[PDB]
Amino acid sequence: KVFGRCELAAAMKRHGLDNYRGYSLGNWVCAAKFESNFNTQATNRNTDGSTDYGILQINSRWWCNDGRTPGSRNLCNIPCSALLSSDITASVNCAKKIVSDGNGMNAWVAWRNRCKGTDVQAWIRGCRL
Ligand SMILES: [Cl-]
Ligand SMILES: [Cl-]
Ligand code: NA
Ligand code: NA
């Protein structure tokens, strides 16, 4: 599923991400835009052989099991394919674990490079929330 901007904002709000660990909703929407272009089916392979999955591009070296990343942890205890669903619940629940691990949203390279320090409230402007 490819989400609309306000549709995703509403879904993330219902799943408890607004101000989760102090990150306002616009941060999560901005990160999803530049990680996946709001496409739940996005996958990208990394140089080390791991792969990133879903709307928030969660990596198989640490967070999910894809059966082909040797020596990986499955810290979210989920198959990586569950992260590609039109239902974002599994991606959101895993992202909450990631953002709590010490480095905040700096775990998402595109957030650090394209969202951090910008007017992220613009990503939810105009949405009925
Ligand atoms: Cl915001
Ligand atoms: Cl980047
Ligand atoms: Na929308
Ligand atoms: Na893994």
From Swiss-Prot:
It holds the Pfam family Lys. Keywords: Allergen, Antimicrobial, Bacteriolytic enzyme, Disulfide bond, Glycosidase, Hydrolase, Secreted, Signal. GO terms for biological process: cell wall macromolecule catabolic process; defense response to bacterium; defense response to Gram-negative bacterium; defense response to Gram-positive bacterium; killing of cells of another organism. The keyword Transcription does not apply. Substrate binds at D101. Residues 1-129 form the C-type lysozyme domain. It is an enzyme of class 3 (hydrolase). CDD domains: LYZ_C (cd16897). The active site is at E35, D52. It catalyses: Hydrolysis of (1->4)-beta-linkages between N-acetylmuramic acid and N-acetyl-D-glucosamine residues in a peptidoglycan and between N-acetyl-D-glucosamine residues in chitodextrins. It is found in: Secreted. Disulfide bonds join C6-C127, C30-C115, C64-C80, C76-C94. InterPro entries: Glyco_hydro_22 (IPR001916), Glyco_hydro_22_CS (IPR019799), Glyco_hydro_22_lys (IPR000974), Lysozyme-like_dom_sf (IPR023346). Belongs to the glycosyl hydrolase 22 family. Monomer. Lysozymes have primarily a bacteriolytic function; those in tissues and body fluids are associated with the monocyte-macrophage system and enhance the activity of immunoagents. Has bacteriolytic activity against M.luteus. This is Lysozyme C. The gene is LYZ.
